Design a protein around this ligand. Structure first.
Ligand SMILES: *[C@@H]1O[C@H](CO)[C@@H](O[C@@H]2O[C@H](CO)[C@@H](O[C@@H]3O[C@H](CO)[C@@H](O)[C@H](O)[C@@H]3O)[C@H](O)[C@H]2NC(C)=O)[C@H](O)[C@H]1NC(C)=O
Ligand SMILES: N[C@@H]1[C@@H](O)[C@H](O)[C@@H](COS(=O)(=O)O)O[C@@H]1O
Ligand SMILES: N[C@@H]1[C@@H](O)[C@H](O)[C@@H](COS(=O)(=O)O)O[C@@H]1O
Ligand SMILES: N[C@@H]1[C@@H](O)[C@H](O)[C@@H](COS(=O)(=O)O)O[C@@H]1O
Ligand SMILES: *[C@@H]1O[C@H](CO)[C@@H](O)[C@H](O)[C@H]1NC(C)=O
Ligand SMILES: [Ca+2]
Ligand SMILES: [Ca+2]
Ligand SMILES: [Ca+2]
Ligand SMILES: [Ca+2]
Lengths: 217, 217, 217
């Protein structure tokens, strides 16, 4: 069942599943996981690990909650740090970030490789080169940073980045992207605590849609 | 098939299903049923049997329709009275009611047990003690009453509550809650015919989101 | 699996699946396909093969992409010309087209039979009699015409209808319906390149919702 089953969303596309949606794959350790496949963007076959679309889910969550994953298949979610590690541990996944503003402008960024380490390495981000994208590069800054949540500060700032910027991320001191920030709906006077991508719409605009996704390259 | 399969949304959570969504459970008689699990609210592991979110579905329905269930897995639904009975017949399920107003403020009510009887007993409500909730108690009033729809009047009113308040419920003479009422979108001049919870926002305010859900005690 | 399994959304309804949403059916050759069932409209049991609702998906796509299907189970999609052929080849399906404008007026058209031929016959449209519908008949004009996309012109125009009208359809010279056109959101000055149904809201109005769906006649 593991040995016959699909291992990635790319396997599902290869087997004739052409519509984005939730499907079961088998992780390298043979555990089944139901994931969101994007078969429509940029050739299809992406496994989606983060999705924001309407502000229905609270993303200001603790370490245990980020570790296991949270949210809803009907809408917004974070798939979980243990899962994202399992998906990216071996071989090379590319990363794409898709963003939509409240005027329906679509922007994206793409990186050559993306891996997150295990819990003992604090889900350390190992990110390859910026390839291209109309949103510009707001992630290379975050290479080689631990993941941090409000109750576990692993950042390089003397304060608590997750609390200061009301999110959870691979904060440094502190960010140029904050896609797990608050769903603040376009322009906000609060500083850099929204769904922000600095090179895209800046530190005072919160996107309508965010998706982070991976595929074998 | 059934022997070791999950019996509730709580079993699924215990087995590592951390994302809300539609999953198959095996009812006490081993029939499979695809249900909506809420893995987030209040510890997670709730089986959701009513959901209102945008007024896309007509809830002013007849006895046969309430018996069978109606609506959409992608939006609003009533799971069905035969199914709700099968879910709650054996072994103490708690009830939670989650309500959201049009300014995104959340209120709730929780009850120590909840069951509905079979069709012959008119899906009679058997409700345990109010435990707590910021919405206040607007369901104890309905304890030990038959369900009624427009076309099957088992209420304690000389006329027809379901027609007068455009819903379906365990009406007495007539109600303090009406969550299968019309989707009237906030404050409404019309008396008590909306998605109303008397002790919450009162008889002239119709919530944006209603969910009714159960979990083993 | 196949000879006992459901063949259509109508079989699923007859077997007690009362909620709209995505389910597996078995095509005439026993291939499983996950499809969207509309268990409400006109008694229920329709298999939905096109859905537009918010302009999130690009429908200006090439022949290969129309052939396989594209979009998302979570929103807008085209189920795919090979699939639609398989669904409509044997046993005769009626067609219903559901349309909603931006003021929430609902209109429909219904045809007694609908089939599309295989790829070698360019997914030729074979349409039976108009039965009824408030949207009026804007599909008989397209009877017995090949499907065309921007990169494969099988139309009866000297130029390229798919390009001129920014869609994909059984174009003649060129159209009176264009439901795979651009999501232009109500009135538009551009001529006939939106989600248009001529006999409904005309060549300069793009509907909010369009669904195309089939059921055994
Ligand atoms: C990820 O970040 C860690 C810092 O947390 C980087 O570790 C540091 O790596 C540098 C080299 O890039 C180390 O410098 C070397 O130190 C010794 C002297 O102690 C010296 O012989 C060399 O001249 C060089 O300066 C640094 O010590 C090390 N720091 C720690 C605390 O381990 C790591 O390299 C970064 N990883 C990547 C892939 O960039
Ligand atoms: N097949 C059902 C019938 O069983 C039902 O009695 C009728 C009216 O239902 S109501 O909920 O709309 O009143 O509609 C549906 O077509
Ligand atoms: N893998 C597909 C190709 O097979 C397709 O021909 C091409 C253009 O598609 S279009 O619908 O966007 O024109 O992109 C897609 O990535
Ligand atoms: N132009 C079509 C014919 O081709 C068809 O034979 C007839 C009956 O079709 S029916 O599917 O609607 O029974 O209708 C219309 O006249
Ligand atoms: C419930 O109601 C009926 C009257 O409608 C009564 O005969 C019965 O004893 C009641 N049981 C309880 C616990 O109230
Ligand atoms: Ca810090
Ligand atoms: Ca009656
Ligand atoms: Ca009465
Ligand atoms: Ca031509």
């Amino acid at each position: 069942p593991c040995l016959t089953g699909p291992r990635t969303c790319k396997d599902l596309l290869d087997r004739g599943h052409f519509l984005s949606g939730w499907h079961t794959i088998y992780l390298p350790d043979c555990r089944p996981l139901t994931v969101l496949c994007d078969m429509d963007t940029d050739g299809g076959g992406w496994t989606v690990f983060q999705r924001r679309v309407d502000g229905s889910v609270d993303f200001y969550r603790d370490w245990a909650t980020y570790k296991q994953g949270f949210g809803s298949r009907l809408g917004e979610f974070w798939l979980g740090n243990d899962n994202i590690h399992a998906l990216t541990a071996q071989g090379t996944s590319e990363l794409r970030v898709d963003l939509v503003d409240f005027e329906d402008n679509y922007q994206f960024a793409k990186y050559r490789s993306f891996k997150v380490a295990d819990e003992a390495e604090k889900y350390n981000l190992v990110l390859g080169a910026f390839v291209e994208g109309s949103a510009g590069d707001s992630l290379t800054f975050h290479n080689n940073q631990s993941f941090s949540t409000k109750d576990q500060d692993n950042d390089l700032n003397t304060g608590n980045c997750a609390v200061m910027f009301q999110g959870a991320w691979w904060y440094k001191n502190c960010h140029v992207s904050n896609l797990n920030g608050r769903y603040l709906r376009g322009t906000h006077g609060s500083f850099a605590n929204g769904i922000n991508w600095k090179s895209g719409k800046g530190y005072n605009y919160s996107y309508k849609v965010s998706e982070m996704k991976v595929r074998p390259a």
